[PDB]
Every structure is written in C-alpha cells, then in structure tokens.
Design brief:
Blueprint (H helix, E strand, L loop, with lengths): L6 H12 L5 H11 L3 H10 L4
Helix pairs in contact: 1-2, 2-3
Subcellular location: Nucleus
Organism: Homo sapiens (Human)
Subunit structure: Interacts with XPC; the interaction is suggesting the existence of a functional equivalent variant XPC complex. Interacts with PSMD4 and PSMC5. Interacts with ATXN3. Interacts with UBQLN2.
Amino acid sequence: GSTLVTGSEYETMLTEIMSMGYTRERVVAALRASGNNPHRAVEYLLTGIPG
C-alpha cells in the first residue's frame, strides 16, 4: 500500500536531484517546500518556489 517515504528513499531522492547540479542545501530546501514530492521539488529548483 501507500506509505510514507523512508529515510533511505529520501536520501536517494536527495542525491538523485543533486546529480542535476544542485547543492545539497538547495535540494533539501526544495524537498521541504514540496513535501518530498520530487516533481515539485525539481520544478522549484528549475523555475522557483511559489511566490
């Protein structure tokens, strides 16, 4: 069933997005802003957070 992401899955998501050329600090902030939705996190990194 649908469960919350695990810590290890979060870390792989974080490092995967970092491989696009973003610092760890920025990706962590984007993932927080997106609620661990990688699609929104990447959108925020590409074109900016809401506002």
